Write a protein that binds this ligand. Structure first.
Ligand SMILES: NC(=O)c1ccc[n+]([C@@H]2O[C@H](COP(=O)([O-])OP(=O)(O)OC[C@H]3O[C@@H](n4cnc5c(N)ncnc54)[C@H](O)[C@@H]3O)[C@@H](O)[C@H]2O)c1
Ligand SMILES: NC(=O)c1ccc[n+]([C@@H]2O[C@H](COP(=O)([O-])OP(=O)(O)OC[C@H]3O[C@@H](n4cnc5c(N)ncnc54)[C@H](O)[C@@H]3O)[C@@H](O)[C@H]2O)c1
Ligand SMILES: NC(=O)c1ccc[n+]([C@@H]2O[C@H](COP(=O)([O-])OP(=O)(O)OC[C@H]3O[C@@H](n4cnc5c(N)ncnc54)[C@H](O)[C@@H]3O)[C@@H](O)[C@H]2O)c1
Ligand SMILES: NC(=O)c1ccc[n+]([C@@H]2O[C@H](COP(=O)([O-])OP(=O)(O)OC[C@H]3O[C@@H](n4cnc5c(N)ncnc54)[C@H](O)[C@@H]3O)[C@@H](O)[C@H]2O)c1
Ligand SMILES: [Cl-]
Ligand SMILES: [Cl-]
Ligand SMILES: [Cl-]
Ligand SMILES: [Cl-]
Ligand code: NA
Ligand code: NA
Lengths: 260, 260, 260, 260
């Protein structure tokens, strides 16, 4: 239970971050959500957190590819919550192409969101956590923060960067009651992956479910997707006392991807 | 909750394994304990599991440096419990000396217990878990399964071996409902570490608590020991549904040791 | 011997890159050098490559923090050399501060040079190497591409990014006669390190050589600096036929830093 | 050039170790060879080292699964050579089966040769190298010292053990003029692999070369075997001055296996 705790989850209007925010609210935390989407869907998500789970929930729209907007979002989030105990740096994008054709603007956008926002969000949250002597920074990296695949230069670079940044954050805050860890999922069937399944299905001339099986078989020995609910469970574990001395590390939920 | 589950923890009469067994019994599992010690202390530990937590508990004495005794211990444990759902391969020893003075018998004893028993215990448990379609094998490795320190040749070799064996076990059982993971703790103040603190205190001419602080400062950036209760919490997490797609990996609770 | 080969070394007016360029010229390669410095020193370096080693050498000034300037520098370098066989992505900067005080402009400058220039230089070189069926991309990462230290958020993030980008480049070009690898040095006594030795000497009130010994002892078990000449030797090895199937990996010359 | 140096290569009557010994003799080292095979073939190999390359060569038969025989082999080798500067711990075996069917005797034989012989050979060589202030210990691990595959429990455990032991040896000898590193090859077409190609060919009903292509495609992105000559080149590099501060690390020649 995280009763009383104050959490922020970036990129929590879809996918993994939405499940993060739900699992943290179910554990008792007040939650700031963030991300793009239809305003009616975002407001139903926010109000649902409150009416199902009895916590306070706030939506703060901020495009976290901008540094100053990210730092201002953390300040606004802490003012909404009345503190900041758990920061989940989750928002991210993907684009696939080989390096020599990889658009310069897509490199810059993926480095901006998937790596630099993690730095700016951590920098703005740390003073709050240092003053109270307790905090959790949970970065959502990927198996692609530990290994690579073709056609993902920017995203692999950024996710490896997040794993390094996680280590530095942990070391600088060692023993202060603040931990920083990176959850490294394998494939999770969110819109970010469904586009890649559709691309495989067009390339091979197969139906979408046969394409999802091919996407899994190439990388993930369990042949099953990781779920957003399992990842929410991992974030709740990282937020627990059992994880007080887990810091600076990666928690791989990847179906065996990195074991081979 | 692990209500109904049947667990075996090797080397659970002291230290980390004792806390493993307690946390699994608190979660509702029946437990087989194992290890050396005074018979009166072992029987109080066994009866305490039952009277505090309402589960069934059995002590099976087996020296797991012997292959056949390890395989026969798993069979006896499964017969006691009426199944076998969670195996925690925890028993281990240490001996410190530089390689050219490292006793051949101590190399063989640490390879036998800290590595080969993990193989023989896994081999005997897997058919039970494969027939039921569910299992957890939780190997207790170390930060010394990922990095080294001087004067620990056998133990670093064995623990690196355990991390490799964990990966193979996970891959061979991928998708079968069986996961295998290695908990990699940093320093935990058990008798295995207290001997090394006493050696530092004699080498430096300092009191025991100043020696424990020196032992921590050299390796563990948090400057705090990992606790056996935290490790029990990690084993309960690995046994949970949130960890169904966590397989073949390491879970480092090490205070930042491996981040630098 | 690399007789006939055409090499580019970024950031080769000082430090490690200067020794890279010398060792590649000694092996017989024509060399493009690059970087900042006094024009008289840069021209003596360029002319020395030609008069000592009998190769052709060119200096191309380009600030590789700019994407388009980096891509245009590779085109100009290939036009100067009449091809491009070996690209050494070496230029880099450092700045130390804890995350919450780390200047936003210094984060952006270190990501721009130490990570994004490696992407833009690789993207511009690859088509040349793909058309000829042979190439070497040698990225200069760091032990801080594998582990972290305090107060180096940007640089650790960038160097971890370089190690990930190296893997992607290798995978996308697998079997095409092109390899990509990251040399990961420990401490090398160049101006980038001498500033950090001077900071230690001021913090501790000790002379500069006692400060260099402290800098080494904290991280580098050999207690000796890695030399630029040794790193040049490693780049010549990576450029050799023995390394035709070495691709996507790290070559650590770090005095044991990453072994513990 | 290694003119004057005195080298020992275990398991050098076939495969990679034979090429190790040839490349070290070509560089000028005197060489002790070892391993099983036909006596006429072994004596032609020994005499060929001398007549082609002008060095001294000795064959010492020792089954290195026995500890005392391994330590006595190093003493005999040093007496033959008049010293011992480079030790290449190469001898190894393979056996494939899933863990629950993996023969206990095959586990013990692979741990004995592939891991414990590396310990006993290092322990016996180190005092010689420590007295002279110079040495190279080159352990032949595998990509399976860093990642796993199914059906290779013992061998993955042993090779991970070798990578850990390499780190300890490097740390204990840091700064003493002695380095220890692990060459981690991907697939090399020796008899140890040809048996696995033949097994794939029988399983799939395909000719041997189609089976070798399948074996490569599953693991090795370059789709080309690593050669024994390339590995000999890597051992000569590790023995060179450029590698004086390369210690405690892995040198992966694996065609991209570990990059993904
Ligand atoms: N899906 C997977 O298989 C997978 C695997 C490993 C890691 N991840 C990581 O998980 C994280 C979440 O991804 P997902 O799969 O849930 O994707 P998703 O596309 O479902 O969700 C991305 C979320 O980020 C938000 N977002 C996008 N751009 C933003 C911006 N500029 N500012 C603020 N918010 C922004 C989106 O609105 C959305 O809420 C990402 O970091 C991704 O890299 C995903
Ligand atoms: N204490 C630490 O800092 C630390 C850190 C990382 C990993 N570990 C690992 O944690 C595990 C438990 O160690 P601990 O610190 O709790 O040590 P401990 O000495 O307190 O407990 C070891 C347990 O193993 C049992 N045991 C010893 N030899 C046995 C044998 N031949 N057969 C059966 N049981 C045997 C002992 O009786 C005892 O129950 C070991 O694998 C150790 O390597 C410990
Ligand atoms: N010195 C070490 O201990 C050490 C250790 C590991 C890795 N490295 C890496 O080695 C590489 C070289 O560093 P060094 O120690 O030789 O440092 P250095 O400062 O001596 O040399 C840096 C070189 O980069 C050039 N440079 C700087 N900014 C540039 C820009 N915007 N565009 C083009 N060139 C630019 C400089 O003019 C100089 O030629 C860097 O990537 C560094 O991260 C250094
Ligand atoms: N072939 C590969 O793809 C590959 C890949 C990675 C690592 N390796 C490692 O390379 C090393 C050499 O293997 P290889 O492929 O050349 O195999 P190989 O079978 O051709 O050669 C093995 C050598 O070891 C000797 N040997 C076997 N048992 C011995 C014993 N008990 N005592 C002394 N010598 C013994 C053999 O006689 C032979 O000289 C092994 O450690 C292997 O694990 C091989
Ligand atoms: Cl890939
Ligand atoms: Cl150490
Ligand atoms: Cl540090
Ligand atoms: Cl496999
Ligand atoms: Na480390
Ligand atoms: Na891998």
């Amino acid at each position: 239970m995280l009763k009383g705790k104050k959490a922020v989850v970036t990129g929590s209007t879809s996918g993994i971050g939405l499940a993060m925010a739900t699992e943290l609210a179910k554990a008792g935390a007040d939650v700031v959500i963030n991300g793009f989407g239809q305003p009616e869907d975002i407001e139903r998500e926010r109000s649902t957190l409150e009416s199902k789970f009895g916590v306070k929930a706030y939506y703060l729209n901020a495009d976290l590819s901008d540094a100053q907007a990210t730092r201002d979002f953390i300040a606004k989030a802490a003012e909404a919550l009345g503190g900041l105990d758990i920061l989940v740096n989750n928002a991210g994008i993907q684009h696939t192409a080989p390096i020599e054709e990889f658009p310069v603007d897509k490199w810059n956008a993926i480095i901006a969101l998937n790596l630099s926002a993690v730095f700016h969000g951590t920098a703005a949250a740390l003073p709050i956590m240092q003053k109270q002597g307790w905090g959790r920074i949970i970065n959502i990296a990927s198996a692609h923060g530990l290994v690579a695949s073709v056609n993902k230069s920017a995203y692999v670079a950024a996710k490896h960067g997040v794993v390094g940044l996680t280590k530095v954050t942990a070391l600088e805050n060692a023993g202060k009651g603040i931990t920083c860890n990176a959850i490294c999922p394998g494939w999770v069937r969110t819109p970010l992956v469904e586009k890649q399944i559709e691309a495989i299905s067009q390339q091979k001339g197969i139906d979408i479910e046969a394409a999802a099986r091919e996407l899994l078989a190439e990388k993930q020995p369990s042949l099953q997707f990781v779920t957003p609910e399992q990842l929410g469970g991992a974030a709740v574990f990282l937020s627990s006392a059992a994880a007080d001395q887990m810091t600076g590390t990666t928690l791989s939920l990847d179906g065996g991807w990195t074991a081979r």
